[PDB]
Design a protein around this ligand. Structure first.
Ligand code: 88J
Length: 223
């Protein structure tokens, strides 16, 4: 409830993000001028569907591990029972990784950083999931227009994970209290930075979960 407590939560959220964000934003930004040549692009397109899914499933799985570390460094999260930790991470972790991808997305030319250089959608053609790739590019383009800071990303992804509506929770009221305090931390932070305007602009509920197709499920077969 307290203002000092709310400030402590904000620093808690931002600290854990800063240590689990995986790639440094200043490196991502420095590399925007480094674009795959047409020859390097064609090299990705000549991958087999399986080879290209093995590569992307490696990335997705790596990124989930970091989101799991992110959650476990939040003080309120380890207080929850382990069942509820599982239910939240299972239902929310892939959605956080998708949000985290907006940092690798350069809205200026509609390219994404991938394995060392920026490339267009055509780079993922060998997945055979054009619709999906397109939908992900359009979602990142939406988030990039908000000019999220690292702190704002940290707080937003916290609210993706800490959702009292996930079915299967056995201490619903605990996660509700946590969700409410995180909403207060988010709103408080945005007021102190005069950035409350973004709340109206956030992607609507459901559209982010709409991203997660079965294309990105059952990835164990890829090793
Ligand atoms: C837009 N889509 C097609 C994607 N973009 C991605 C952009 C970046 C990454 C990174 O993994 C990453 C992850 C987290 N934070 C920073 C970088 C990455 C790139 N270079 C080194 N890394 C670690 C992975 C992406 C993936 Cl897997 C997909 C994707 C691939 C297949 C299906 C769906 C999405």
């Amino acid at each position: 409830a307290s203002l000092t407590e709310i400030e402590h939560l904000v620093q808690s959220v931002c600290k854990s993000y800063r240590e689990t964000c995986q790639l440094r934003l200043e490196d991502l930004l420095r590399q925007r001028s480094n674009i795959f040549s047409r020859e390097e692009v064609t090299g990705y397109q000549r991958k087999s569907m399986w080879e290209m899914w093995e590569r992307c499933a490696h990335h997705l799985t790596e990124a989930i591990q970091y989101v799991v570390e992110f959650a476990k460094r939040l003080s309120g999260f380890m207080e929850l029972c382990q069942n509820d930790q599982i239910v939240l991470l299972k239902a929310g972790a892939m959605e956080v990784v998708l949000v985290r991808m907006c940092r690798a997305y350069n809205a200026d030319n509609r390219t994404v950083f991938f394995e060392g250089k920026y490339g267009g959608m055509e780079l993922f053609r060998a997945l055979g999931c054009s619709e999906l790739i397109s939908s992900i590019f359009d979602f990142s383009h939406s988030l990039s227009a908000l000019h999220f800071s690292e702190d704002e990303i940290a707080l937003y992804t916290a609210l993706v994970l800490i959702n009292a509506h996930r079915p299967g929770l056995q201490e619903k009221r605990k996660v509700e209290q946590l969700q409410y305090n995180l909403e207060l931390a988010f709103h408080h932070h945005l007021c102190k930075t005069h950035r409350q305007s973004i709340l109206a602009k956030l992607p609507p509920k459901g559209k982010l979960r709409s991203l997660c197709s079965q294309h990105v499920e059952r990835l164990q077969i890829f090793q």
